Amino acid sequence: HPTTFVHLFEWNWQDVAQECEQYLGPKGYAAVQVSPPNEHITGSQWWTRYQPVSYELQSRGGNRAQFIDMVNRCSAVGVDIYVDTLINHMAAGSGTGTAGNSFGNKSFPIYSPQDFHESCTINNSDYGNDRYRVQNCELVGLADLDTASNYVQNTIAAYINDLQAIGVKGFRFDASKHVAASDIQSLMAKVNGSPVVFQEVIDLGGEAIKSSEYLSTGLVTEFKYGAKLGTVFRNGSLAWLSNFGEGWGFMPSSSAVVFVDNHDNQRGHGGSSILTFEDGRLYDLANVFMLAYPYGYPRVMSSYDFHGNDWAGGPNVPVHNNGNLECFASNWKCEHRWSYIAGGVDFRNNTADNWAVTNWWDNTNNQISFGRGSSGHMAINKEDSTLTATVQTDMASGQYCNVLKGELSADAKSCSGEVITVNSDGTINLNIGAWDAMAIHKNAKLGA
Ligand SMILES: C[C@H]1O[C@H](O[C@H]2[C@H](O)[C@@H](O)[C@@H](O)O[C@@H]2CO)[C@H](O)[C@@H](O)[C@@H]1N[C@H]1C=C(CO)[C@@H](O[C@H]2O[C@H](CO)[C@@H](O[C@H]3O[C@H](CO)[C@@H](O)[C@H](O)[C@H]3O)[C@H](O)[C@H]2O)[C@H](O)[C@H]1O
Ligand SMILES: C[C@H]1O[C@H](O[C@H]2[C@H](O)[C@@H](O)[C@@H](O[C@H]3[C@H](O)[C@@H](O)[C@@H](O)O[C@@H]3CO)O[C@@H]2CO)[C@H](O)[C@@H](O)[C@@H]1N[C@H]1C=C(CO)[C@@H](O)[C@H](O)[C@H]1O
Ligand SMILES: C[C@H]1O[C@H](O[C@H]2[C@H](O)[C@@H](O)[C@@H](O[C@H]3[C@H](O)[C@@H](O)[C@@H](O)O[C@@H]3CO)O[C@@H]2CO)[C@H](O)[C@@H](O)[C@@H]1N[C@H]1C=C(CO)[C@@H](O)[C@H](O)[C@H]1O
Ligand SMILES: C[C@H]1O[C@H](O[C@H]2[C@H](O)[C@@H](O)CO[C@@H]2CO)[C@H](O)[C@@H](O)[C@@H]1N[C@H]1C=C(CO)[C@@H](O)[C@H](O)[C@H]1O
Ligand SMILES: [Ca+2]
Ligand SMILES: [Cl-]
Ligand SMILES: [Cl-]
Secondary structure, eight states: OOOEEEEEOOOOOOHHHHHIOOOOOOOOEEEEEOOOOBBBBBSSGGGGGOOOSSSSOOOBBOOHHHHHHHHHHHTTTTTTEEEEEEOOOEOOSSSTTTTTTBBBBTTTOOGGGBBBOOOOBBHHHHHOOOOHHHHHSSSSSSSEEEESSSHHHHHHHHHHHHHHHTTTEEEETTTTGGOHHHHHHHHHHTTTOOEEEEOOOOOOSSSOOGGGGGGGGGOOOOOHHHHHHHHHHHHHOOGGGGTTTGGGGOOOGGGEOOOOOTTTTTTTTOOOOOOOOGGGGHHOOOOOOHHHHHEEEEEEEOBOOTTTTTTOOOOOSHHHHHHHHHHEEEEBGGGGGGGGHHHHHHHHSSSSSOOOOOEEEESSSOOOOOEBBBTEEEEOSSSSOOOEEEOOOOSSSSEEETTTTBBOTSSSSSSSSSSSEOOTEOOOOOOOTEEEEEEEETSSSSOO
């Protein structure tokens, strides 16, 4: 049933907790990826979170008690917390952290200069041909930890195990490409149990380091997914997506974390083809495809309008602002609450017993429909005409809520939005307006 997580980028711990109770739990999201909760450098830019100072849980998102409160309140409604984990480095330079600690010259509350690789600079060419420099030199001046050192592994493992002890269920290993896979292996041997671990490795091909090196240590970000999906949605034909996945050169589905955009590449950090909230309904549709299609573990992005400043932090108005939700406009965008996206999550959540593509249909261009066997069916019309084809499904005949537009009542007698009819012979007579879609599934069926 739970199948999809969401990055609540720069949401603080109280907003996450309330969001779990009021929306993510009820709508079936599996987990929240939170911004780094450990002590980091002072400053309001979002990227301060990626400059650690210590592993005390005092950060822009809140203090340790507030962190625990969020973990608990989210867990109470069935939503896990995944922590963005800085395994590669500490802050650059000298300064002060969010818990009051000072640092400088590769000296921190828990590290000294010997705990780091010798200073050198990762240069653009190194990605293509110097594995050693990519993993032992400094990413944009950040102090590169000696991740082969037993002390460093133990210290990072203690941070991970502290977070597990208080209830955290997964971890994003930031900048995993900059850490030898064998160092990550040694780290994981000190990590208690088997939490969810996904490793951030950007590999579109042609580099010294390969995302495939990381398959044995956890899940891996498949950045090919969003890159190719955005190119297809912008310039290509949806019909080509019938074998999306391993046939496009992607890693195995059971290893991949997939997403349309992430916090870096919606700003042009870490792809002019990447779709983001800025693309409106094109983003809706791309998310509907992602969430209906049986490849990967999807992460929905949840952003703020940064008003053209790719460095700015988030709005200084909370999401839950004394009874008003600061979503959808020029503060928080709340893509995870957009109807087509949350509906796609419901569809994925209820078609997970059938990880196949069935009865693929298309018009050779930008209209597609397919099924998850008898568990669900979907269609996307990304053209300017109305889509009225008759398509074959394996669905039981009857009437179904279009979960992109509404939901089934508690009594199961009605839908709050459009109702789709599956005929006696299992067909559907589509009637999909331009740039619209539909999705139905067996657990959103009107019941006699
Ligand atoms: C941002 C990503 O950079 C690399 O990606 C490279 C790909 O690997 C390569 O294939 C090709 O596409 O190029 C890109 C390089 O542009 C890393 O591999 C990838 O891991 C990284 N993403 C994640 C990790 C980091 C680091 O913690 C995050 O970086 C953000 O935070 C840093 C540090 O604050 C910020 O840098 C700022 O500080 C420096 C000085 O320290 C100054 O130059 C300036 O003030 C700031 O830019 C980065 O801007 C920011 O991207 C990233 O968010 C993670 O997702
Ligand atoms: C929820 C789950 O979704 C995804 O898992 C699906 C795989 O991607 C599919 O490939 C398929 O896996 C089958 C393998 O293909 C096959 O080789 C064999 O190993 O059997 C597998 C199981 O049938 O179906 C999987 C769904 O069953 C995604 O890849 C996976 O990561 C997702 N699970 C995550 C989410 C939750 C949230 O609670 C956690 O419990 C899991 O630990 C996460 O990994
Ligand atoms: C928040 C909202 O985002 C989305 O819609 C964007 C559209 O995709 C863009 O096309 C554009 O809409 C313009 C229309 O195209 C145009 O016809 C005219 O009506 O002006 C519109 C606004 O300028 O901009 C939209 C964002 O401003 C996304 O598709 C949509 O689903 C999102 N709506 C959510 C928000 C509300 C508000 O509570 C909810 O009621 C909906 O259920 C959510 O889906
Ligand atoms: C606790 C220190 O451990 C490590 O030092 C080892 C080093 O690995 C080898 O020389 C073997 O012996 C020394 C002494 O144990 C770390 O390399 C060193 O950085 C550690 N000190 C840091 C940690 C603490 C507290 O966690 C601080 O008190 C200290 O200031 C800080 O530098
Ligand atoms: Ca490194
Ligand atoms: Cl702490
Ligand atoms: Cl990522």
